Ligand binder design. Sequence first.
Ligand SMILES: NC(=O)c1ccc[n+]([C@@H]2O[C@H](COP(=O)([O-])OP(=O)(O)OC[C@H]3O[C@@H](n4cnc5c(N)ncnc54)[C@H](O)[C@@H]3O)[C@@H](O)[C@H]2O)c1
Ligand SMILES: NC(=O)c1ccc[n+]([C@@H]2O[C@H](COP(=O)([O-])OP(=O)(O)OC[C@H]3O[C@@H](n4cnc5c(N)ncnc54)[C@H](O)[C@@H]3O)[C@@H](O)[C@H]2O)c1
Ligand SMILES: OCc1cccc(F)c1F
Ligand SMILES: OCc1cccc(F)c1F
Ligand SMILES: [Zn+2]
Ligand SMILES: [Zn+2]
Ligand SMILES: [Zn+2]
Ligand SMILES: [Zn+2]
Lengths: 374, 374
Amino acid sequence: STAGKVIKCKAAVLWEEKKPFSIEEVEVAPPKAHEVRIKMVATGICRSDDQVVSGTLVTPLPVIAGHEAAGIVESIGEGVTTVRPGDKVIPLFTPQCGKCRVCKHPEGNFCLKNDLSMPRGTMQDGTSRFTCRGKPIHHFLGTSTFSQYTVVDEISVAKIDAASPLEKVCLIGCGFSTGYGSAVKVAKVTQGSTCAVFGLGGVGLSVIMGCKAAGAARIIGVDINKDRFAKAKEVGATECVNPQDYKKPIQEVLTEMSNGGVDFSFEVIGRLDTMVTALSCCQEAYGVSVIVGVPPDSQNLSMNPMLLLSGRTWKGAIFGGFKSKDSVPKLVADFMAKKFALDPLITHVLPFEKINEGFDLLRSGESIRTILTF
Amino acid sequence: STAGKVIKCKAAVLWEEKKPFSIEEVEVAPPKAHEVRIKMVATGICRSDDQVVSGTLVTPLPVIAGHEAAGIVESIGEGVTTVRPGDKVIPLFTPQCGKCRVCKHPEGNFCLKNDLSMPRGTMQDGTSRFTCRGKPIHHFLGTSTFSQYTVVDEISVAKIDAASPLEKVCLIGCGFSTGYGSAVKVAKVTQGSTCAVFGLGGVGLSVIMGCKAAGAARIIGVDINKDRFAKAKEVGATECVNPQDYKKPIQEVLTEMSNGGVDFSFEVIGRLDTMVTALSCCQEAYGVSVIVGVPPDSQNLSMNPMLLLSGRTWKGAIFGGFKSKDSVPKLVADFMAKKFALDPLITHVLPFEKINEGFDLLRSGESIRTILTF
Ligand SMILES: NC(=O)c1ccc[n+]([C@@H]2O[C@H](COP(=O)([O-])OP(=O)(O)OC[C@H]3O[C@@H](n4cnc5c(N)ncnc54)[C@H](O)[C@@H]3O)[C@@H](O)[C@H]2O)c1
Ligand SMILES: NC(=O)c1ccc[n+]([C@@H]2O[C@H](COP(=O)([O-])OP(=O)(O)OC[C@H]3O[C@@H](n4cnc5c(N)ncnc54)[C@H](O)[C@@H]3O)[C@@H](O)[C@H]2O)c1
Ligand SMILES: OCc1cccc(F)c1F
Ligand SMILES: OCc1cccc(F)c1F
Ligand SMILES: [Zn+2]
Ligand SMILES: [Zn+2]
Ligand SMILES: [Zn+2]
Ligand SMILES: [Zn+2]
């Protein structure tokens, strides 16, 4: 019925920075070769989507944002072989083309087809599938999940278990997997280690879950909002510290708590100063610090390279280092098997139509993750 | 007939920054408990010693510098068990106490008893065994090898093979091991990888030897001094590039040459700008960059953290990541077994009395390593 035809549906369009989303009718073109059109079932509100609104994460406007979602394939373009109409799917903000140097590397996951490094806001072919008020609307990271229907390149979608609860697993599309993988895959947290986690929102909580899963003996939560501490301890933090409580810089406090520095630190906020703090708080000879949070556009940090010379390792990762198309289905399967929990991350649920209230809850600090249902 | 007595001998004293060494008589006190007095046989001139003269590496003056050396034990203090008079030894600028948390960690080597982080310029007990002109002289990194005799703490000395050529193996005390281990132990260069080495002095050449030994398929030497290329190729470099030959920044050149970034980059110069450049030239998703060069005191670098978020790993190390007391005798054994070569690194061999000439060779770029003999 809708196959091969333009679909008119509602989407949350962001016409300008620092403005509310405008929920309105958009036209969604049918999928071209190697593209997939998806009816969205649920989508998470991630801090990154808000950074697009704030303008600290830069991507071309106007745009349909949203990148953490789950849905059902409405139709496929010519040539698609990995999903079919009716399949449950999670769109991948980091693609997996499977052919580039990175996809073929055993460790890398930042596929060269990503739209993150030099964002164009289009499909892989350099055009848009979205029209609103007669004007072309940009995509975001090849996903654009703030729409009843979106179109994504095949390399940016993964087929998941047919029995998956889409209102929970959308988190595997961003927040959960990013935090969990930062701990278990990127940092490679070891059994008996001490970890510090800067930022106790959805992603930071996921890092704590990964730290616990890996067998960390101590997991120190760091956040300026003490209301986050309860849930952090629930998912595995052994102690929580608020830097505003201390007269000395937090890296000194943590170094003292850990009796000379932590084995593993994680910056999960997106501030330049906390990236440097987190690197400093790891043990100077063998510590590892992982940058997860997204820094403000085009800003450089300043640091003393002697921090590195002594032995520290500093690294960052997108999407927890997971090769996206390979891992998402495996992660969903693991979820179905009760290997990890997602409920602790979801604090609010709202209809898609209340997306602006959802962003208000994030901005206010009230929610961890709000899931929007279509 | 010197054991237990003060020794009057010649040393090269640095009384002031930016001045020649003064070759003169000093008094060397006998070793106290757990100390070892060494008659120096050979000592290398390392860029780091020149950084002490330059004032860019800060340590209390006046000082007897020198940290890359080999000699023979003259006498030992009470309680020493790992060396005995007549033993061939290499002083270790990074000690191995074997009891601290770093020493007990499987990866770390920056022992907490080091005099590098916050230099005191003394023995472990906070005193000096050197007197010159009635004035106390500081030690340098617990070693001070620019003297016919020095006294070092037991944790800062390693017994080596009785048949070692001391005029060669002194390089295992700093230069060779630092470069070699940075490749094979810190970066863990993999077979068939592409490596880039910034700085083709003695340490950079040892990095190249390590990269070659690790099975790298391409090893790109980077230096502004084209005179270094020939030797770099002899020890394993496949290509050499001079940044001054190009109109575009060298990270762009290296990224193009390596079809998207190198696997492993090494900064072996000590410049803030080349540290960032070396990081940038490694592949954005899986590249690893190792800082080896010692940067100028108290200077911060500026960098865009997106370089790390995409997947890059940045680390540094002291002494090639080798746990010093454990590795040095093994490295010497390996040298005696012809597993690596040291002759390529030695370009000049001078009597100790010509130390200042030796330093002039380094500053002018004429030498790679000059070895001073006593
Ligand atoms: N690397 C990736 O692939 C990836 C994926 C998803 C999200 N992110 C990024 O991760 C970061 C965290 O996302 P999130 O959804 O958990 O965000 P969030 O806003 O829900 O959580 C951030 C937390 O940091 C805390 N915080 C703020 N300032 C702080 C300070 N000075 N010290 C300590 N804590 C402080 C806040 O109180 C909050 O609890 C964001 O920057 C987001 O863009 C990265
Ligand atoms: N991490 C450690 O344990 C350790 C140990 C020994 C030495 N070091 C440091 O390693 C560094 C190198 O030591 P070395 O003994 O090889 O010194 P060196 O002076 O022998 O070598 C420096 C090389 O860098 C090159 N160079 C200078 N400026 C450059 C530029 N802008 N671009 C490219 N190349 C440039 C020079 O031409 C020279 O060949 C020094 O900073 C030294 O202090 C560190
Ligand atoms: O939250 C998704 C995300 C992860 C990393 C970098 C981004 F820009 C981004 F939008
Ligand atoms: O060359 C020896 C050395 C290595 C690393 C750091 C230093 F300060 C230093 F002097
Ligand atoms: Zn790819
Ligand atoms: Zn996200
Ligand atoms: Zn130690
Ligand atoms: Zn040295």
